[PDB]
Amino acid sequence: HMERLLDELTLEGVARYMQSERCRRVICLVGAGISTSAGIPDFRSPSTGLYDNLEKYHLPYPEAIFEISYFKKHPEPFFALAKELYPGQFKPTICHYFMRLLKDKGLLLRCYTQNIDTLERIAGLEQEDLVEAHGTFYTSHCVSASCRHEYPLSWMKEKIFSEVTPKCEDCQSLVKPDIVFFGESLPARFFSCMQSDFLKVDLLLVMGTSLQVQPFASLISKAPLSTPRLLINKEKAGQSDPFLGMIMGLGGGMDFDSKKAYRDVAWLGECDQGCLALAELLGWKKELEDLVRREHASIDAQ
Ligand SMILES: Nc1ncnc2c1ncn2[C@@H]1O[C@H](COP(=O)(O)OP(=O)(O)OC[C@H]2O[C@H](O)[C@H](O)[C@@H]2O)[C@@H](O)[C@H]1O
Ligand SMILES: OCCCc1nc(-c2ccc(Cl)cc2)no1
Ligand SMILES: [Zn+2]
Structure with a gap:
């Protein structure tokens, strides 16, 4: 039915997709790993x-x-x-400011966060950009x-x-x-935003979460079947064979590694380093580093 959107299951493939006209709206799904x-x-x-x-x-x-x-x-x-x-x-963190940069690039449809540290707001995301889930x-x-x-x-x-x-x-x-x-x-904002956002998301950026709690874990399965999903995390999350007590519903998870993988990419490491690497591929790295540098300085000055 729907065509495949990544030319290869790598960070480089995601980067080329993001620079294409087909990647218009990005949803970020983040957890405590982006603040460690x-x-x-x-x-x-x-x-x-x-x-x-x-x-x-x-x-x-x-x-x-x-x-x-x-x-x-x-x-x-x-x-x-x-x-x-x-x-x-x-x-x-650098990861927070990468999401802020997505906002400034006009690409950020929404950031769904499981965190309560408010660092998304401090980084410059506005209330309408955020679902504090x-x-x-x-x-x-x-x-x-x-x-x-x-x-x-x-x-x-x-x-x-x-x-x-x-x-x-x-x-x-x-x-x-x-x-x-x-x-x-x-x-309630979680559900009203979810119902509309996940019909028109071109890329899921999943960062710093183990995907171990519902209903947040269900969000990756709410995107269209063609929507690429990039995980930046220390460990693979959301990918496993079924087992008694699993958190995800059947077929609700990521497929990075099987012979049928077609849209999911895992970049394993620190979120800050993953976003720097992705920014570099996009030509945004100095821009991102400047943003972090200037915003951290402005924070200290105030
Ligand atoms: N610097 C890092 N870079 C990349 N990944 C990291 C880093 N630090 C940690 N990680 C990874 O980031 C992940 C942290 O996963 P979890 O500790 O479960 O945080 P959550 O946000 O998913 O917990 C969600 C809810 O569960 C609670 O009950 C609360 O209700 C929460 O709201 C791990 O995979 C780490 O390997
Ligand atoms: O279900 C969501 C709970 C979010 C939450 N996290 C915390 C927390 C408190 C102290 C420390 Cl050190 C670390 C985390 N409180 O609420
Ligand atoms: Zn009362």
Whole structure:
């Protein structure tokens, strides 16, 4: 039915495709891997990832600290962890500024991020460019569906940095930031943007994510079957034979390596280096390095 769009399954092939008139709209799908070079830990890297460093909270399992039913029984661990990450001021990475450059080149249809560090915004992506798929800590809400009283960040800090579990002033239920926990619905914007974006995406750029949580993992299968998909990641993600307990639905994954591979490319390494390499192939490398240099300087000056 649809023609094949990559002339070869390499970064060079993706680069030639991006410079063609057929690549008009790029969607970026990113996770915590795009911020580790800034100093923010990811979740699932062995030894260094967050989930291997929560022994002190004596959880039944690491994910419980971000699960809504456990949170409602034992909310203290999450708030203790939240103040462990608060003090750091972080700069966006080369990878963040590559997405910013896609925006300035008119190619960025949308960035879907699982991160809450807001570094996409700090890099210059605007609200309409972004789907913060796993929420934000900027706003908070009571957890009672009958209440849902909204509280600002200043209110949340006042409770946290004063050693009190935030409780709603109307119903005394727990109040948490609008970070999406396991068991919680995603923002409505996620679905309204998804329904429209993935009908008109020419390239999926998947960076710094293990694709281990739904529904975000489903997004790679929402693109048209002809749409090339480039992974820039330390490890292959989304490619595996089926097995009991797999996260992806049947046939919902990447195919980099089988005899039937036709559109998926894995560039294995650091996200910063992968974006530099891709920029170089596109003739954008000095432009990208200038952007990072000038934007990091402007951040420091302010
Ligand atoms: N500098 C790097 N360069 C390239 N890849 C990297 C780098 N650092 C890490 N990686 C890779 O980046 C990937 C990190 O995958 P995960 O740690 O699962 O982060 P997520 O965003 O997918 O977790 C999503 C949700 O799961 C949680 O429950 C939360 O709800 C999250 O929102 C790995 O494949 C690393 O090899
Ligand atoms: O389901 C999405 C959860 C996103 C989330 N990540 C964090 C976090 C807190 C502290 C540290 Cl060190 C690292 C990460 N909080 O919420
Ligand atoms: Zn309430």
